[PDB]
Structure formats: structure tokens, C-alpha cells
């Protein structure tokens, strides 16, 4: 909607430890943080690029802006992917944040396709073993079932409490700003301000917005960076701070808040029950691992539980006081001797 809160900002490049191939790089899809706070299993991922905006600050759901060296660039939303152990389903996107549902895995990967149609990826260690809502480790989501509490990341692209800060970026070193016009250094600034310092007497350090030529100096005696930035960016742990006490020029809200909702689970089919004095015998069809528990209803409850994997017979002692038996997500069964 109106998420013009990103207009003064830009995406950025940052350290990625596995850009593919088991090698680290400086990535436009560096991951910052993976959240797994919703008990429904949804993952909320933060990346160094911005999703849903052109480089002109205009909103477009089919576009994604990253940084190509010093210049923000447009790219295809359609090329964005999250992969973990096996490909994920992206539920939501806004700026730096991606809502995805992922299979169980140990790495988490996010990538996209740039304008030149190169794949860019980034991968982090991430144990993803989303623990089970209910008492049945099920694998197909049912219609006929019981609903239970859970938490989710809603798809609200708007106006939350949680915030990240956007600052003045630090100066950007770039060796290609300098070339060796034999015997001298030529600083080529494109259309930018360059802060430079050369370790050779005469025209040592300063600023320039024009192509400047420093005399009688070699390129490995000079340091050049792009300064006077006029777009803001997240003060990432993977980027230097521009000033000692930092800077700050704005804030961006974190979409997709954690809301508290309901999830469906199945109920394991009612077990076949046969009876003897002080004894109950139960056949169990788990369609999937189903938890079985039971307790005496006297002073000594003697809790027992086990996960039933496949079809099974269970023989239970029914004391004078009676027995309570919870079979997965069903309501408890109660038995007394006659």
C-alpha cells in the first residue's frame, strides 16, 4: 500500500558466508536475521535488498531493488527464492523482509536474478525443525480436525511498533576509482564525490567531484572512496559505522507482526476397544505418529506416554479407580472396572 517509508533509503552489499560454492563474498542478498517466533512454523527473513520498490521509490509488486556496486538497480521479483533443505514457499514480501514456509533443514538460502540474469544467492546455517502443534506429527493438512492455538506472521504491510534504523552509510572504498595513467594516478569519479588520500608529496588528500589527475604517484599509494551519500541504509552489523556515535536519518517498521491465531490438526481415528476385568485392549491406526498417554485417576496417576508410529495393539491395566487414555488429538477416553 502506502509503504513510502522506504523512499529515502537504498539496499546495500554485505558479507555473505556462502554465496554458493562454499565460498564467502560481498552479496546483495546478505541475510541479516532469520526469525522463527511463530509457532505455525513460518519464517520471517531479513535480507540486504529491498522488495517491492523500483530504484525511483515507486511501488511495484513485480520489482525488487538491490545494489549494483554504487548504484541501486532494478530486478525481477519473480526470480526471488528461499530454499533451505528443499525449496520454500514465500508467503509475503516487503522491502527487506520475506515471509516463507520452509521444509525441515539445516541451511537457509535466499537468492534472486539480477538484470543481467545472473543468480545471486546467500546461505546461512539454520536449524529449522518447527515443533508440532497438537499431539499428531501429521504430514497432510486435513479438513476434518480440531483447531488449536498457534501464532503466525500476518501479511500486514503497515505501521507496526518494531523498527529498524536507517543511517548515513559510510564512505565506499572502490579501487576502480583509480587508474595508472603511466607515471600518475587518474581518479575517475563518474558522477559522484570522491574522498581520496595519496601518500606522495604534492596533492596528498582531499575531495573531488571531477576527474582529477594526481601527479607522480602510483595507484598502490592512494586510497579512494565514494562519499556524500544522499540515501539512507540500515546500520547492519556487516557494514561499518560512518561516525563513532553512529548516525541516524530515519526508521523503517518491521512488517508481518506476530499475531495469535488458530491452526487445524487431525484427530486420529477412534481405536478399537475390547474389555476384560481390570484390563482394556486397544487397536490403534496412526495415519502418522500419534501420541498416546494414560494416567490412573486415583492418588498415584502413573503418567505414561509413547508415540505410536504404525498400527499397534496396546494392553492397559484398568485399576479400581479407572484409567484415562488420551489418543493423539482426540478427547480423552475413560474406563472403569465394573
Amino acid at each position, epitope marked *: 500500500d502506502n509503504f513510502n517509508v522506504y523512499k529515502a533509503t537504498r539496499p546495500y552489499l554485505a558479507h555473505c558466508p556462502d554465496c554458493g560454492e562454499g565460498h564467502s563474498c560481498h552479496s546483495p542478498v546478505a541475510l541479516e536475521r532469520i526469525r522463527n517466533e511463530a509457532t505455525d512454523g513460518t519464517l520471517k527473513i531479513q535480507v540486504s535488498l529491498q522488495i517491492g520498490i523500483k530504484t525511483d521509490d515507486s511501488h511495484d509488486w513485480t520489482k525488487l531493488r538491490y545494489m549494483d556496486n554504487h548504484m541501486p538497480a532494478d530486478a525481477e521479483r519473480a526470480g526471488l527464492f528461499v530454499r533451505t533443505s528443499a525449496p520454500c514457499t514465500i508467503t509475503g514480501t516487503m522491502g527487506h523482509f520475506i515471509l516463507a514456509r520452509c521444509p525441515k533443514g539445516e541451511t537457509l538460502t535466499v537468492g534472486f536474478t539480477d538484470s543481467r540474469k545472473i543468480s545471486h544467492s546467500c546461505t546461512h546455517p539454520f536449524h529449522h525443525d518447527p515443533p508440532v502443534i497438537g499431539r499428531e506429527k501429521f504430514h497432510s493438512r486435513p479438513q476434518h480436525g480440531k483447531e488449536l492455538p498457534c501464532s503466525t506472521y500476518v501479511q500486514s504491510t503497515a505501521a507496526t511498533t518494531e523498527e529498524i534504523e536507517v543511517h548515513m552509510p559510510p564512505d565506499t572504498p572502490d579501487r576502480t576509482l583509480m587508474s595508472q595513467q603511466s607515471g600518475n594516478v587518474k581518479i575517475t569519479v563518474n558522477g559522484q564525490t570522491v574522498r581520496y588520500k595519496c601518500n606522495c608529496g604534492g596533492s596528498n*588528500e*582531499g*575531495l*573531488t*567531484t*571531477t576527474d582529477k589527475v594526481i601527479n607522480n604517484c602510483k595507484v598502490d599509494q592512494c586510497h579512494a572512496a565514494v562519499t556524500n551519500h544522499k540515501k539512507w541504509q540500515y546500520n547492519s552489523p556487516l557494514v561499518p559505522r560512518n*561516525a563513532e*556515535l553512529g548516525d541516524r536519518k530515519g526508521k523503517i517498521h518491521i512488517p508481518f507482526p506476530l499475531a495469535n491465531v488458530t491452526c487445524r490438526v487431525p484427530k486420529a481415528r477412534n481405536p478399537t476397544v475390547t474389555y476384560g476385568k481390570n484390563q482394556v485392549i486397544m487397536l490403534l491406526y496412526p495415519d502418522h505418529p500419534t501420541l498416546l498417554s494414560y494416567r490412573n485417576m486415583g492418588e498415584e496417576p502413573n503418567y505414561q506416554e509413547e508415540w505410536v508410529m504404525h498400527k499397534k495393539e496396546v494392553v492397559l491395566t484398568v485399576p479400581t479407580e479407572g484409567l484415562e487414555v488420551t489418543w493423539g488429538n482426540n478427547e480423552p477416553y475413560k474406563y472403569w472396572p465394573q
Partner: antibody
Amino acid sequence: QVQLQESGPGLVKPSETLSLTCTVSGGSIGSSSYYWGWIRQPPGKGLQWIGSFHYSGTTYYNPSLKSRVTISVDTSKNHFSLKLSSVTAADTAVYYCASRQNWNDGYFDYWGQGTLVTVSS
Amino acid sequence: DIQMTQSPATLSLSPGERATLFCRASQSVSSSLAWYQQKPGQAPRLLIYDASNRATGIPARFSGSGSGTDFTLTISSLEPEDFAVYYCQQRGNWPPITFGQGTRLDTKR
């Protein structure tokens, strides 16, 4: 946001060291501007940039004065300061302290109200 | 070592008129130019920067144009406020930051 006010002796004799204090109001030094600086103006003439102290600690000096100019920041008193050594009558001028808060570029958008410094014996 | 020349030295005009001022650098400074206003006895006041951008709160009648080495300041319709001395500054290649000698906008009568 911030206000700069100069503080100076006014009359300095030759070969002594002119010393000026620009005191900053409404914001701490280390956070209030991208360049602090000193710019002078002799009577009846234009402006001459003397020096600038960048927030990174780099100091940029005018080449015709670098051998005599020191600019420092005292964050314990929110003021930056100029020391111009070995003074002659040409140094007689209105001295301005100035700052650039809004872009990190090399212009000047906040100004003090300059102090006249005369040089004679 | 950038040299800045302003023109004319004196521009004596009546209020409400359009006024135009010229600044020229000894070599290309891209658009890295600024225009400062200074009224007698005061500090310079930043009017224009990067040769076209207007400083915070500067009236919309002020505007700057030009690139390379040749720059124009234009005041759409002079107000009594606007009669002062205008300097141009370079930052295209510094230090040293260098200024022009000024133009004196006198009030005709």
C-alpha cells in the same frame, strides 16, 4: 538546529598566535555537523576558506596556510578552535566559524557571527 | 587551484525586477557550486548548492543553473530583502575551497 558563536581576542600583535574558539549550542560537537570550519574575510574583500575539521577526524587546510593553521575539537566543552601562528597584518580580518550539518559535502549552511581580529603593534 | 570569477561587479536594479548573476570557474567543477547571500555586517547565508538545489527555507524565486564552468543565479522578482552581496563557492575539487569576489546588488532609485 545548532548555533555557532565565535570567541576571540580582537587585537593580536605580530608574530603572536591568534587563537579563536567557536562554541556550539543546541547539540554536541561529535554529532551536530559533518564539517566544522573556519573562513575569514578581510575588510572590504571577499571570503577565504581557512580550514575544516571533518567528523572523521581528518583536517583539511588551505595550502597557503597549512604551515600555520591548527583546528581542533574540544568535545569536553562543545567548541572547536583555530590557532593561527606567526601573524602579520594581512591576517587582519573578520573570522567566521561555520558548519555543514545537512549533507557531508563541503559547503557551509550554519554560520557563526564573525569576530573582527585586528593585527598591529 | 580553482579560481572563481563573478560578474558583474555591481548590478544596480529596482525592486520587483528579474536579476541575473554569473559565476565562472577556472576549470570544470561539475555542478559542485553554491551561492551565498551576505547582507552588510552579517554572516553569509546559503542560498543555492550543487549549482541548482535550494537551501532549507530559501524563497522559491531564487534558482541556480549551469554546469561545467559557467553558472547562473537568478532572482525572479527582487524583494527589498534581496539587495545584498552574493558570492559563489566551488567544492568540485578541494582543498582549498575557493570563493568568488562577489556581486553587489544595489537598489536603483
